[PDB]
Amino acid sequence: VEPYKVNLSQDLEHQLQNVIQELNLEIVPPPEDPFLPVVLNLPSQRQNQIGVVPWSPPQSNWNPWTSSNIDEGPLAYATPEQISMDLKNELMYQLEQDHDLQAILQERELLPVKKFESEILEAISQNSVIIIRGATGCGKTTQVPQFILDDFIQNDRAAECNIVVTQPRRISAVSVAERVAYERGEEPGKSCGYSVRFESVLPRPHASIMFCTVGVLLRKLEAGIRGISHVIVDEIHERDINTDFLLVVLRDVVQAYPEVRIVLMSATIDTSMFCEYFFNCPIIEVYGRTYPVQEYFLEDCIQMTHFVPPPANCNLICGDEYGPETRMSMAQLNEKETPFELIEALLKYIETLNVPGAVLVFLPGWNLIYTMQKHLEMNPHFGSHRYQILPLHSQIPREEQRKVFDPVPSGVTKVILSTNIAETSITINDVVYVIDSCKQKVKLFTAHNNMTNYATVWASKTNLEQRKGRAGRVRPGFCFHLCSRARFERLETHMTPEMFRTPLHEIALSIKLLRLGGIGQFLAKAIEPPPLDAVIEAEHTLRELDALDANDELTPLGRILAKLPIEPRFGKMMIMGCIFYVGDAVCTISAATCFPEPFISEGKRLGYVHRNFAGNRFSDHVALLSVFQAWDDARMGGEEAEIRFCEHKRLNMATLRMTWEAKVQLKEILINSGFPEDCLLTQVFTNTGPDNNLDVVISLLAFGVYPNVCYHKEKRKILTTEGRNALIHKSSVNCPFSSQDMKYPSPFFVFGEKIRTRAISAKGMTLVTPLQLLLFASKKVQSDGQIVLVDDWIRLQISHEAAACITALRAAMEALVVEVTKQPNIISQLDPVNEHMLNMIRQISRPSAAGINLMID
Numbered sequence: 001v002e003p004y005k006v007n008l009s010q011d012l013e014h015q016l017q018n019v020i021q022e023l024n025l026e027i028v029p030p031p032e033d034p035f036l037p038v039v040l041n042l043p044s045q046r047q048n049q050i051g052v053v054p055w056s057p058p059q060s061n062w063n064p065w066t067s068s069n070i071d072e073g074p075l076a077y078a079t080p081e082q083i084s085m086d087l088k089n090e091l092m093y094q095l096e097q098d099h100d101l102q103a104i105l106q107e108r109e110l111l112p113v114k115k116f117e118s119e120i121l122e123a124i125s126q127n128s129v130i131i132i133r134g135a136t137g138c139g140k141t142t143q144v145p146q147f148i149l150d151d152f153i154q155n156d157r158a159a160e161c162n163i164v165v166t167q168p169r170r171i172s173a174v175s176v177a178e179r180v181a182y183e184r185g186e187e188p189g190k191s192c193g194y195s196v197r198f199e200s201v202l203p204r205p206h207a208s209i210m211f212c213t214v215g216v217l218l219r220k221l222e223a224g225i226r227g228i229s230h231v232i233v234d235e236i237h238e239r240d241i242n243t244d245f246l247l248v249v250l251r252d253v254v255q256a257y258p259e260v261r262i263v264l265m266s267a268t269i270d271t272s273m274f275c276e277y278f279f280n281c282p283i284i285e286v287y288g289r290t291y292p293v294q295e296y297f298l299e300d301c302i303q304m305t306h307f308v309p310p311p312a313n314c315n316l317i318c319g320d321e322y323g324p325e326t327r328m329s330m331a332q333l334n335e336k337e338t339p340f341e342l343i344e345a346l347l348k349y350i351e352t353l354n355v356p357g358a359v360l361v362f363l364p365g366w367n368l369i370y371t372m373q374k375h376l377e378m379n380p381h382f383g384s385h386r387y388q389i390l391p392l393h394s395q396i397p398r399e400e401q402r403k404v405f406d407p408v409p410s411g412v413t414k415v416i417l418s419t420n421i422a423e424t425s426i427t428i429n430d431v432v433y434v435i436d437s438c439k440q441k442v443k444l445f446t447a448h449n450n451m452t453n454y455a456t457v458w459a460s461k462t463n464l465e466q467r468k469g470r471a472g473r474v475r476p477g478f479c480f481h482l483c484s485r486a487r488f489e490r491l492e493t494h495m496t497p498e499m500f501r502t503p504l505h506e507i508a509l510s511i512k513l514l515r516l517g518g519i520g521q522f523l524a525k526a527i528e529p530p531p532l533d534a535v536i537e538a539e540h541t542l543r544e545l546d547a548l549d550a551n552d553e554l555t556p557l558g559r560i561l562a563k564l565p566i567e568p569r570f571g572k573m574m575i576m577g578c579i580f581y582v583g584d585a586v587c588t589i590s591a592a593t594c595f596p597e598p599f600i601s602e603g604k605r606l607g608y609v610h611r612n613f614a615g616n617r618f619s620d621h622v623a624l625l626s627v628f629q630a631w632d633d634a635r636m637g638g639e640e641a642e643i644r645f646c647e648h649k650r651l652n653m654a655t656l657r658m659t660w661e662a663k664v665q666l667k668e669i670l671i672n673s674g675f676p677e678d679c680l681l682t683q684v685f686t687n688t689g690p691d692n693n694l695d696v697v698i699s700l701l702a703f704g705v706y707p708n709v710c711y712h713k714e715k716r717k718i719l720t721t722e723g724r725n726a727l728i729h730k731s732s733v734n735c736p737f738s739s740q741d742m743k744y745p746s747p748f749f750v751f752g753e754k755i756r757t758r759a760i761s762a763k764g765m766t767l768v769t770p771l772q773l774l775l776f777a778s779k780k781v782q783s784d785g786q787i788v789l790v791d792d793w794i795r796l797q798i799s800h801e802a803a804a805c806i807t808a809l810r811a812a813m814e815a816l817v818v819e820v821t822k823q824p825n826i827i828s829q830l831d832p833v834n835e836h837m838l839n840m841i842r843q844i845s846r847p848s849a850a851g852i853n854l855m856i857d
């Protein structure tokens with residue numbers, strides 16, 4: 001397209017030149033002829049040792065969860081024996097007195113894992129490492145940590161027991177901690193606790209179990225595994241990347257500290273790979289009753305329901321022994337869609353069998369669960385009189401999650417519309433019927449075009465077998481697979497482990513913070529090492545950020561980014577926010593990326609109230625900051641004022657509260673890295689009037705989400721950095737409500753995630769000026785004297801000197817970030833030479849700097 005004309009005043013051009021001259025910053029001079037354009041853009045003590053995370057056993061005067069001495073109260077001097085006796089007696093009394101708890105223990109003693117209690121405890125006592133293998137629903141997760149704890153309590157060694165249980169999912173760590181507390185007559189906070197990203201309930205310091213995500217454990221290993229007797233690594237068969245990484249750390253720990261106890265727990269898969277990795281450790285097999293399950297495929301499903309679709313490809317392939325209508329009907333179904341209407345027809349077929357039982361439906365993600373749910377409540381046959389239809393995904397509230405376990409009024413059918421959470425991590429009771437979409441949801445990132453694909457993909461044969469088996473724990477069962485018999489044949493046996501297909505920059509920072517050695521050298525020792533290109537891309541990413549120096553050693557910037565649990569690029573954006581004294585707002589934007597949107601839109605275009613949060617800034621990120629300011633104001637009135645605020649504005653309160661908490665924790669980590677309190681205060685802003693603080697926040701957001709820049713042609717059509725076409729996401733404040741066109745005062749936009757569906761979509765969009773483009777959303781800039789070319793995709797008609805001056809500001813800003821990370825309290829100093837540079841960036845963040853007044857039309 002035509003080069004875009006930047007309207008830069010003479011006053012500003014000279015101000016830019018003066019600041020570059022005052023500070024003696026290097027500029028590239030204009031070119032000689034327009035056919036040779038010029039680019040405007042221009043060590044610590046290594047070791048090769050393989051470090052080991054140190055280990056030390058529980059100690060009576062040590063709180064292993066807070067990693068500090070017990071100083072106050074009786075536990076500071078109390079002997080192990082005193083502590084063990086008290087806890088032993090406390091437990092014996094509770095079990096004599098509580099009739100409801102006695103009934104709960106009776107349920108426990110009937111779980112299949114119960115009969116193996118002795119064999120498991122003998123195996124753990126005799127071996128540094130063991131594997132416990134058995135079917136989903138035996139009681140590995142809920143029972144085994146209690147068996148170990150109760151073994152120590154009942155043998156007068158309560159004080160010698162502290163257990164870490166890792167789960168691959170946030171929802172599993174929380175849920176399991178709530179379930180195990182309930183099984184012990186408690187709420188989390190006594191014998192059991194949980195620690196996940198941005199939320200914890202710490203257990204008591206003694207004879208306690210902490211359920212956590214691996215990320216939390218790795219972030220807390222900076223001082224070693226101190227005061228812990230057992231590490232239980234759960235659901236290893238999921239090949240969660242962080243679990244694979246932790247298995248490398250714990251193998252080194254075991255070797256150097258054989259008194260530690262590691263316990264790996266697996267579904268029924270081949271565990272020889274893990275077994276061999278951990279020096280041929282014992283495998284304790286665990287099993288109970290299972291019933292046979294009749295399994296059906298798409299063609300079987302079409303025949304027994306007489307179903308007829310509306311008006312390579314394994315739906316055109318069907319065996320001779322099926323009817324000509326089955327073949328014809330199957331052949332009409334797109335394999336990339338899930339057939340909602342066939343599922344409806346399968347629930348009705350199940351009614352005719354007259355055997356009571358719950359139906360578990362496996363759907364890839366929340367998008368198809370919502371769609372299947374709405375589809376059913378359209379037909380009044382699927383109302384409360386006959387049907388309890390419950391969604392199960394990680395984002396439904398925990399109140400709603402528990403309801404999938406509740407019994408149901410006689411003559412009502414429980415239907416769980418579930419993600420693969422219900423494949424191996426939880427067991428819904430009363431399940432006799434499984435409908436399997438035969439799909440998985442996976443996050444695929446591609447670094448080269450910065451494309452996120454929430455892709456719907458074929459499941460493995462091993463997933464289909466596990467899904468089939470969820471129908472066969474109560475009585476003989478049925479599994480209705482919605483893929484052809486000819487698609488089944490082409491299925492891989494296992495999923496690609498996440499280590500093969502996930503970015504490694506966060507794992508790389510953890511390796512460096514924990515001093516485990518070289519990134520490539522440590523990942524080479526993984527059970528299944530990641531591919532070379534992923535390691536090369538991680539090192540390259542952390543080197544562009546200046547998280548690693550020339551020697552690939554941790555910079556002081558690296559150390560901060562490693563300690564912040566968000567994307568490193570966002571960590572660096574928060575340091576820059578601190579330097580500009582807008583820390584709180586940049587911490588809010590970073591925290592919000594870890595949680596679903598607070599707006600309850602229901603996959604439709606935002607209406608008036610949601611759009612009003614945007615002001616005149618054409619920015620989803622400003623909409624979010626304005627929501628958080630209004631919500632925090634309405635919260636002063638108390639809980640009911642907060643609930644009413646969130647109901648009247650259609651906002652998810654739980655999302656607003658978790659984001660705020662996450663923001664509080666991010667800020668605490670910067671405080672502890674030496675950042676001054678007063679660069680992180682909440683600052684009132686307006687989303688319509690002049691606001692230099694908000695101008696700077698939007699500049700810093702361009703940096704954060706780079707390389708996500710786009711150019712708006714017309715309507716919803718945008719051009720991405722690959723020269724390719726894309727759509728403004730329906731959910732954006734920048735998406736036209738109807739046919740009235742938006743009059744953007746700039747065509748340039750930054751966005752959260754570039755999404756591949758059928759088209760390329762920009763989601764969470766913020767308008768930026770051409771000046772902000774050049775300062776923070778540009779890696780490479782070539783000038784011919786008249787026209788500059790930005791990252792080989794878009795052209796500005798702008799002065800050469802202005803573009804070179806803005807590029808030199810970016811470099812000055814990078815060099816200040818390096819200085820500030822060595823010595824964060826220089827933010828306080830407000831040194832005059834830095835202030836001169838910062839004030840010029842403050843000035844070119846103004847909409848007025850690029851000829852724009854957002855208050856006019």
Ligand SMILES: Cc1cccnc1-c1csc(C(=O)Nc2cc(Cl)cc(NS(C)(=O)=O)c2)c1
Pocket residue numbers: 064065066067164195200202210212216217220221224225226227228
């Ligand atoms: C609230 C608070 C006040 C003061 C200090 N700390 C916390 C805290 C917040 S979360 C948290 C945690 O998760 N600690 C934690 C988890 C895990 Cl999974 C293990 C181990 N112990 S260790 C390293 O393995 O020896 C320790 C502690």
Ligand SMILES: Nc1ncnc2c1ncn2[C@@H]1O[C@H](COP(=O)(O)OP(=O)(O)O)[C@@H](O)[C@H]1O
Pocket residue numbers: 111135136137138139140141142143179402405424425426427428429
């Ligand atoms: N929240 C809960 N409500 C009711 N029953 C539950 C709950 N959580 C777990 N259970 C039951 O506990 C039993 C054992 O589950 P679990 O320990 O997860 O087994 P495993 O880890 O071996 O698959 C199952 O029958 C399951 O249904």
Ligand SMILES: [Cl-]
Pocket residue numbers: 703706776777778779
């Ligand atoms: Cl950049």
Ligand SMILES: [Mg+2]
Pocket residue numbers: 140141142234235424425
């Ligand atoms: Mg389990």
